[PDB]
């Protein structure tokens, strides 16, 4: 079965972030999304353990 | 995250695999209602089978 | 205290002994700091019914930390000067002349031609000296150690001890990162119309933890706190070069920063 | 848990709390107590009693109004502290005289 | 990956030795160079899970990203003109070959357990340089390393019969490799105990497209390789922070680029405005746009010079007639005034004085780490030689690593022995015999001239042994040997 998500963002946001924090924000989003998937699967395993 | 040191993985190089299981049985019909297993960790009791 | 920083317990003992020796000295009726260079002294004046050291504490705390900030600006600049042409070679040539090392040549070597307790000691000292060089990997990196001393104005190392059997379990040095250590001196004494006392100063140092990434500065932060460690634990040296006044130590390339830019 | 940034690592407490911490066996053991030896209880010298169990920097509030303790967390950063102080002007002296009479 | 399990075994043992010894009570981590930082308590070693993901990702998205820009820059400089010769000369001096001579060679001039071991090391060394195809590629390996300041090779092992596993290694590409270290240990108010670091590598393919337009599909990569599994060397050149290793050409990036830019400025100046340039101007007010056009067209399409020098051949396009001694042109004046006209534009006048290029070119050469003799014994040549030796000393690890590897892997030596033995057992590089002879010749002539000067007093005030040891710089043994050989020759 699959899992997957998208970035949901735009250029103006990045422009502001470059000025505000000095962030590119692409990797930031990718890392976040990666993180969510890995954590969610982790829960998936634990929760199924608890279930079963 | 407690990634996978609390569960098995058995990673695959393809989707949707299969796993085989073996059971020793008795009563001349391995597939039947009432069929009995020969070995089981919760009972292995049948001291009357080859006997009286 | 309870010496929470057990890390340097054997070094603390070394400083205690030296500090006690100073307390037993007759170096009194001295208005001067009795200092020339190195660690930054200040009036942490105590052990008297006025307690002015509190202002000294608050000054260091409240103003944290133009001393090291300036030091960073200078060092960062020093590196950036070295990055250009000619400066690059001038440093290299100097470093090479300071430490010349070639096939089957002599390394810096301890020459014990003066009176000693015994020739047996002379050999022990030379053997230890060789290990100091081995600890520094001098024969491979002596040039780098010197270059940093010359360029960044100072070199320093953390000394490592056991600590179970500290006089036996003596280990190699860890070259410390420039810009991370503040060297200090505290005037913990007072008298009639101001201190005229020995002013042992402890002369300890403080290590600022930092974990820069691709920041190329302490862009977000360095790493919070700093640890006060006894002087016995640090090897250090520096150029005889300062700003117009104070312990504002500069590198050899500082003099050229004006025309360099 | 609540911060998501790390386990409490310091406590500021009343004299009574401190006296207890220093007079009991804080390690894992059957049972024990006696005269306080465990930490510094004397505010004359410090505010820092020591580190409780090697985990919490324990400090004493010499001005506690009644009797309580506060447990909290601070991370390796200065921003990750919950509470921060950000001086702009500090310990700046003022000096002069009043010309009328030159009093300082 | 099971592929590197034997190397992991080696790293684990090395890590264990670090844990075994009291390498504690250390604040700043005991690291000189190389790997990028991370810290975590003991984790699941089965795969590069999120702690590693973040470490790698953190080492790749803000990390390899700009490393790649720098390496590509270094390569662009390497492939430019003049600057590449500097590299070539440097590489050549470091790596030379000669007819029926040695090549890099292990010098076993130290005390060793036994001559039979010395012979095994020589054989192992030979296999290593052959593995690297040194005799054909030593120049290429060195060059890439100099330019990039990092070289890596994949280390081979059977491993069922691991003793026989050393084989020709695979040089890995820069821009595909990252150095990674992690601290696993903890104390109060910061970790100050055995921070073993591990210092392993990450390597992948992924977006293999830049100077070559590549094609691939989407895939995850990020492979973790044990330190023991890779042969590698690098420069001592590091940036202001972190452990970002830079190229030997780093110094030249600034001037290499501004020089090229200045050169382009000269070039554009000389070309732009070279041809005749003119604007035909006419009045067309109060006319329909498609009528106004006629006044202009009657001049513009009629007074065009259709004669063109052909850059591809010694001829002028459409020239016939041969060449007019005069270029005849006109404009009509419809208004009763001197209204219409044609103007010319400024041409490519000669203004150089092309002197800036010379300045910048010379500054660049200095930035390229070369002697000023490039366009007898001198200070620059000696300095340069010192430089080459240091470069080679660093490069050399490319042999020492696989050498100790197979010696230990097969079992000839132990690790303890390696460490006690070296203590500098150096691999010498071949030296240019012509130049070496010239240097020696100068020295000899100097020794002779000084001897000659001393001579008149050598039998009365200055001794012979003295002249030999101080003027000719002979050793005592050398002198005795020479005395014996002389007597034999006499009789």
Curated annotation (Swiss-Prot), chain C:
Subcellular locations according to the entry: Virion; Host cell inner membrane
Protein role: Forms the portal vertex of the capsid. This portal plays critical roles in head assembly, genome packaging, neck/tail attachment, and genome ejection. The portal protein multimerizes as a single ring-shaped homododecamer arranged around a central channel. Binds to the terminase subunits to form the packaging machine. Attaches to the host inner membrane most likely through interaction with host yidC and forms together with chaperone gp40 an initiator complex to form the prohead.
Family statement: Belongs to the Tevenvirinae portal protein family.
Subunit structure of this chain's protein: Homododecamer. Interacts with the large terminase subunit. Interacts with the major capsid protein. Interacts with the capsid vertex protein.
Protein name as annotated: Portal protein
Gene: 20
UniProtKB/Swiss-Prot annotation, chain D:
Posttranslational mods: A proteolytic cleavage by the prohead core protein protease gives rise to the mature major capsid protein during virus maturation.
Family: Belongs to the Tevenvirinae major capsid protein family.
Subunit structure as annotated in this protein's UniProt entry: Homohexamer. Interacts with the portal protein. Interacts with the capsid vertex protein that forms pentamers. Interacts with hoc; one hoc molecule associates with each capsid hexamer. Interacts with soc; this interaction reinforces the capsid structure. A total of 960 subunits of the major capsid protein forms the 160 hexamers.
Functional summary from the UniProt entry: Major capsid protein that self-associates to form hexamers, building most of the capsid in association with pentons made of the capsid vertex protein and one dodecamer of the portal protein. The major capsid protein self-associates to form 160 hexamers, building most of the T=13 laevo capsid. Folding of major capsid protein requires the assistance of two chaperones, the host chaperone groL acting with the phage encoded gp23-specific chaperone, gp31. The capsid also contains two nonessential outer capsid proteins, Hoc and Soc, which decorate the capsid surface.
Full protein name: Major capsid protein
């Amino acid at each position: 079965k699959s899992r997957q998500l998208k970035a949901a963002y735009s250029i103006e946001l990045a422009q502001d972030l470059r000025a505000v924090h000095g962030m590119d924000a692409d990797a930031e989003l990718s890392g976040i999304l990666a993180t969510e998937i890995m954590l969610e699967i982790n829960r998936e395993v634990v929760d199924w353990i608890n279930y079963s | 995250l407690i990634a996978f040191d609390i569960c098995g993985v058995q990673p695959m190089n393809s989707p949707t695999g299969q796993v085989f299981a073996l059971r020793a049985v008795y009563g001349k019909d391995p597939v039947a209602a009432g069929a009995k297993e020969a070995f089981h960790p919760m009972y292995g009791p049948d001291a009357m089978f080859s006997g009286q | 205290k309870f010496n929470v920083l057990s890390l340097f317990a054997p070094w603390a003992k070394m400083d205690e002994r030296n500090f006690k020796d100073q307390e037993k000295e007759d170096l009194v009726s001295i208005t001067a700091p009795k200092l020339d260079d190195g660690a930054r002294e200040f009036e942490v004046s105590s052990n008297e019914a006025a307690s002015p050291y509190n202002a000294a504490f608050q000054t260091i705390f409240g103003s944290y930390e133009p001393g090291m900030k300036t030091t960073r600006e200078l060092i960062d600049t020093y590196r950036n000067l070295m990055n250009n042409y000619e400066v690059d070679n001038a440093v290299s040539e100097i470093v090479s002349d300071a430490i010349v090392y070639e096939d089957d040549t002599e390394v810096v070597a301890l020459n014990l031609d003066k009176s000693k307790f015994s020739p047996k000691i002379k050999n022990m000292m030379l053997d230890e000296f060789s290990d100091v060089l081995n600890h520094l990997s001098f024969q491979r990196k002596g040039s780098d150690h010197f270059r940093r001393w010359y360029v960044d104005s100072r070199i320093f190392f953390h000394k490592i001890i056991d600590p179970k059997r500290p006089k036996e379990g003596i280990k190699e040095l860890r070259r410390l990162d420039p810009r991370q250590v503040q060297y200090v001196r505290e005037i913990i004494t007072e008298t009639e119309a101001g201190t005229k006392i020995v002013k042992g100063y402890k002369e300890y140092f403080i290590y600022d933890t930092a974990h820069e990434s691709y920041a190329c500065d302490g862009r977000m932060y360095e790493a919070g706190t700093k640890i006060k460690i006894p002087k016995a634990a640090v090897v250090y040296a520096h150029s005889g070069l300062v700003d117009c006044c104070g312990k504002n130590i500069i590198g050899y390339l500082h003099r050229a920063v004006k025309p360099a830019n | 848990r609540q911060t998501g940034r790390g386990e409490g690592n310091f406590i500021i407490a009343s004299r009574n709390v401190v006296n207890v911490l220093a007079s009991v066996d804080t390690g894992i053991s059957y049972a024990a107590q006696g005269l306080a030896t465990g930490f510094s209880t004397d505010t004359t010298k410090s505010v820092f009693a020591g580190v409780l169990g090697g985990k919490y920097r324990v400090y004493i509030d010499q001005y506690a109004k009644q009797d309580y303790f506060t447990v909290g967390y601070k991370g390796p950063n200065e921003m990750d502290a919950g509470i921060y102080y950000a001086p702009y002007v500090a310990l700046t002296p003022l000096r002069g005289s009043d010309p009328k009479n030159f009093q300082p | 990956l099971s592929l590197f399990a034997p190397w992991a075994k080696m790293d684990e043992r090395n890590f264990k030795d670090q844990e075994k010894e009291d390498l504690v009570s250390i604040t700043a981590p005991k690291l000189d160079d190389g790997a990028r930082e991370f810290e975590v308590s003991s984790n699941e070693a089965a795969s590069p899970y999120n702690a590693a993901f973040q470490t790698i990702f953190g080492s790749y998205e803000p990390g390899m990203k700009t490393t790649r820009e720098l390496i590509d820059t270094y390569r662009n400089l390497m492939n430019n003109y003049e600057v590449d010769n500097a590299v070539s000369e440097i590489v050549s001096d470091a790596i030379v070959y000669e007819d029926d001579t040695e090549v890099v060679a292990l010098n076993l001039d130290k005390s060793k357990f036994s001559p039979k071991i010395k012979n095994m090391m020589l054989d192992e060394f030979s296999d290593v340089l052959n593995h690297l195809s040194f005799q054909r590629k030593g120049s290429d390996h060195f060059r890439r390393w100099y330019v990039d300041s990092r070289i890596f090779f994949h280390k081979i092992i059977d491993p069922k019969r691991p003793k026989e596993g050393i084989k020709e290694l695979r040089r890995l590409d820069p821009r595909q490799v990252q150095y990674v270290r992690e601290i696993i240990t903890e104390t109060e108010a910061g970790t100050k105990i055995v921070k073993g670091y591990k210092e392993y590598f990450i390597y992948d393919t992924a977006h293999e497209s830049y100077a070559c337009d590549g094609r691939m599909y989407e895939a995850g990569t990020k492979i973790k390789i044990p330190k023991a599994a890779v042969v590698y060397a690098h420069s001592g050149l590091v940036d202001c922070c972190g452990k970002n290793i830079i190229g030997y050409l780093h110094r030249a990036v600034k001037p290499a680029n501004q020089l090229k830019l200045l050169e382009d400025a000269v070039v554009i100046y000389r070309i732009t405005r070279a041809p005749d340039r003119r604007v035909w101007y006419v009045d067309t007010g109060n006319m329909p746009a498609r009528k106004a056009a006629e006044h202009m067209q009657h001049v513009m399409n009629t007074m065009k010079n259709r004669v063109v020098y052909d850059a591809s051949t010694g001829k002028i396009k459409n020239q016939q007639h041969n060449m007019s001694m005069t270029e005849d042109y006109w404009l009509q004046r419809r208004d009763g005034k001197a209204v219409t006209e044609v103007d010319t534009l400024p041409g490519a006048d000669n203004t150089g004085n092309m002197e800036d290029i010379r300045w910048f070119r010379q500054a660049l050469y200095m930035a390229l780490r070369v002697p000023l003799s490039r366009i007898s014994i001198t200070r620059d040549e000696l300095t340069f030689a010192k430089f080459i030796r240091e470069l080679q000393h660093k490069f050399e690890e490319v042999f020492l690593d696989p050498l100790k590897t197979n010696l230990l892997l097969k079992g000839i030596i132990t690790e303890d022995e390696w460490n006690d033995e070296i203590n500098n057992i150096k691999i010498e590089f071949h030296r240019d015999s012509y130049f070496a002879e010239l240097k020696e010749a100068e020295i000899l002539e100097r020794r002779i001239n000084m001897l000659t000067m001393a001579e008149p007093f050598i039998g009365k005030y200055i001794s012979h042994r003295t002249a030999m040891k101080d003027i000719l710089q002979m050793t005592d043994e050398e002198i005795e040997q020479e005395a014996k050989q002389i007597e034999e020759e006499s009789k």
